[PDB]
């Protein structure tokens, strides 16, 4: 058999290759629902300070979510996506990265930022579009970004970040960076053409990227039975030549271990890795980790209570400050369209300023800076 497209024997009988979907790729798990390590050889033995940071990052995210979800129901902010059920996938993976590894994602990734110490004030600034927002109030709520923390600004169109993440990874390879790129997306988003683009480019171009697919069984109302018919997303990886694994997304340690090993190999080998974390669309990552903490003697109900109180205060202080800040100067609607402002765009800005000088009483000028 001398065919350039594939490496294979001949076969002299007709046999279609069947998918193995009923017996899929198994789900890697480190701890059970009572927080006990199942297989000691798989214990990451993370130090107490780090495990507590995982726990506190996850619960602070959950506290933030409760307050901002309510704010959205009241129309104080215009849009909100929660992180419920995704706290462990995000904090556990983030902890396995180097602080300078570049992150691309979308809507369920706030925990990565929280782990990287993004200020409550700045999550809130974006959701309120206030003067403190480095995004200048231009995008809908939860479209976070931080240059300092290597977290590329979210955009609404699904899966667009996937081939972008691959290009950034290719660039890091050339820079001899010893840096990885991680790219988060849901199982729905994986149906987009851009996911096929990204997966294939990462493999053929040998890029140090981790693809992190969260599979929670639903994309809005659509169950995965209407989304795909193979064995989830993990089973697609081998067909692209991508090393793949599936993990229990309610187990921070499983997620951490898979991510840490993917990162190690991706940087060293210049090859992509795919992790599919199984979660629930909304036996929660926070409970499981809590049971682990208790078994080590690392937490108790007094600490649980005090932290609940302290974190609610911290979130409420940031929330209140965020609501009271003015919005940015309306002039900022015109900047950053290009790096420089074209003359014809400046003319539009001048047209707005002339209009507001005459008709300004009909606009919410008192709410916006200067």
């Amino acid at each position: 058999p001398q065919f350039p497209g594939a490496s294979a024997e001949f076969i002299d009988k007709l046999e279609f290759i069947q998918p193995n979907v009923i017996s899929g790729i198994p789900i890697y798990r480190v701890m059970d629902r009572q927080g006990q390590i199942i297989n000691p050889s798989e214990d990451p033995h993370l130090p107490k300070e780090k495990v507590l940071k995982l726990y506190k990052s996850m619960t602070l995210l959950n506290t933030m979510d409760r307050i901002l979800y309510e704010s959205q129901r009241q129309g104080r902010i215009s849009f909100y996506m929660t992180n419920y059920g995704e706290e462990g996938t995000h904090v556990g993976s983030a902890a396995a990265l180097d602080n300078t590894d570049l992150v691309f994602g979308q809507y369920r990734e706030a925990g990565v930022l929280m782990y990287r110490d993004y200020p409550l004030e700045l999550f809130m600034a974006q959701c309120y579009g206030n003067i403190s927002d480095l995004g200048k109030g231009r995008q809908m709520p939860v479209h976070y970004g931080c240059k300092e923390r290597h977290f590329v600004t979210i955009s609404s169109p699904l899966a667009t970040q996937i081939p972008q993440a691959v290009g950034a990874a290719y660039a890091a390879k050339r820079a001899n960076a010893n840096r990885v790129v991680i790219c988060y997306f849901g199982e729905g988003a994986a149906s987009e053409g851009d996911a096929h683009a990204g997966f294939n480019f990462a493999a053929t171009l040998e890029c140090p990227i981790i693809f992190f697919c969260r599979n929670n069984g639903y994309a809005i109302s659509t169950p995965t039975s209407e989304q795909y018919r193979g064995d989830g997303i993990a089973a697609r990886g081998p067909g692209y030549g991508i090393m793949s694994i599936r993990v229990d997304g309610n187990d921070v340690f499983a997620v951490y271990n898979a991510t840490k090993e993917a990162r190690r190999r991706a940087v060293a080998e210049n090859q992509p890795f795919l992790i599919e974390a199984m979660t629930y669309a909304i036996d929660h990552p926070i409970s499981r980790l809590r049971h682990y903490l208790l078994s080590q003697g690392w937490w108790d109900e007094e600490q649980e209570k005090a932290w609940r109180k302290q974190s609610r205060r911290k979130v409420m202080e940031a929330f209140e400050q965020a609501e009271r800040k003015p919005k940015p100067n309306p002039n900022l609607l015109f900047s950053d369209v290009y790096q420089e402002m074209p003359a014809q765009l400046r003319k539009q800005q001048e047209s707005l300023a002339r209009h507001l000088q005459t008709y300004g009483e009909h606009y919410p000028l008192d709410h916006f800076d200067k």
Partner: protein
Amino acid sequence: AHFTFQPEYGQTQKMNLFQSVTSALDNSLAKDPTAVIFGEDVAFGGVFRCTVGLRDKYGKDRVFNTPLCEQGIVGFGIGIAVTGATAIAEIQFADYIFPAFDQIVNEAAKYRYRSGDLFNCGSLTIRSPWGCVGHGALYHSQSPEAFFAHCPGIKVVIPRSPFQAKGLLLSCIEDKNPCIFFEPKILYRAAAEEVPIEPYNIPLSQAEVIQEGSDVTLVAWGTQVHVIREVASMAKEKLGVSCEVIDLRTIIPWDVDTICKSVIKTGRLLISHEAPLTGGFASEISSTVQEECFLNLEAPISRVCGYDTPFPHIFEPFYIPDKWKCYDALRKMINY
């Protein structure tokens, strides 16, 4: 809110714009056994409720969910249509039509021409929520019609009300050419109006003069028609100016004759749209009217459009071509 909604065919029922879409779709499926409706999250009734009840009434084989893939949704629809079956695809927000741009522009639009009419996808309609909504920012606000207006072989249609939406959507579904129907999402739950229960049609490529006037012609589509209706009222009360108000309805092919006839009478034109000025559809209308009505023009044609930026979140009230912007432009134009 930035607009006010206000205002022969058998029995009618009060319907908002989403209900009127549902009613059009229901009538279509009842009378056309080939017709199917598909896209993201359409089975449970859609994220804006436009398909509620349809799957239970017509079956899972006729109202169904696709994978999350807009290029697929449109390619799939083309394919249904190539067989002669009616394919009514949904794109969840117009902002997300762009993945399908190659399928729309290189395939659907050219399908009939390039085959010498051996094949076609005439029984395809793509409907999608459109236009600003107060807080949709970059990706829940866009008005993409001018991108499609440069593509011969597709029709682009945009209604201003529930009555108009149902008649125009029925005509799109029955028209023998691939159509894009953009539904102004800010109107989906706004005020209801009487809509006929039974099917009826509003013609494509025909503007509607909804108020007669003699001093200036104002042209818009979608929600912006309600802005210019208010501007006409402001002009009358404050300036004694008589405004002829026209809903374009069909972007392409557009009703050149109706607009030119109005401008020959009034001698003045102001065109308004939420989409950005540069490359916007107002440039096509202005250019054309200048070519046909040069001798009748008393003043430069005005375009009051969104600015040449992406659609912002917190700055929306400063971005849109609101009634005060339209009014001021009109004031200056009358004073020319």
